[PDB]
UniProtKB/Swiss-Prot annotation:
The keyword Iron does not apply. This is Lysozyme C. Transmembrane segments: none annotated. Residues 1-130 form the C-type lysozyme domain.
Length: 130
């Protein structure tokens, strides 16, 4: 599923993401925007280390979910990477929250650093009723 902007903002808010570990909803929106264009089916293979990024947040298989084919990988979210490709984003959100419970927080995603960090991200949530 490819979410429309405001639809996703309310969906994330309902799932408890607004201010989760100090991260505003606009930051999560900016992250989902740049990682997948709000696409839950998005996948990116990383030929360099044999891992794959899954779903709306493009969560990596080497550390967060199990896909069985990533060498020396762990499953910190304790989910099949398949759960990160559902139209329903509850599991992907549960995993994203797990990622940010680590020291780096939102900085875990390099796309956030490049396209969201220190930027005016208000535009992602304007008019959405969040």
């Amino acid at each position: 599923k490819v979410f429309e902007r405001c639809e996703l903002a309310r969906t994330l808010k309902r799932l408890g993401m607004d201010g989760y570990r100090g991260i505003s909803l606009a930051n999560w929106m900016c992250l989902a925007k740049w990682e997948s264009g709000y696409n839950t089916r998005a996948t990116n293979y990383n030929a360099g280390d044999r891992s794959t990024d899954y779903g709306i947040f493009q969560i990596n298989s080497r550390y967060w979910c199990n896909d069985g084919k990533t060498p020396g990988a762990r499953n910190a979210c304790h989910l099949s990477c398949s759960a990160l490709l559902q139209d329903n984003i509850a599991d992907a959100v549960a995993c994203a929250k797990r990622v940010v419970r680590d020291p780096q927080g939102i900085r875990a995603w390099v796309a956030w650093r490049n396209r969201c960090q220190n930027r005016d991200v208000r535009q992602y949530v304007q008019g959405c009723g969040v």
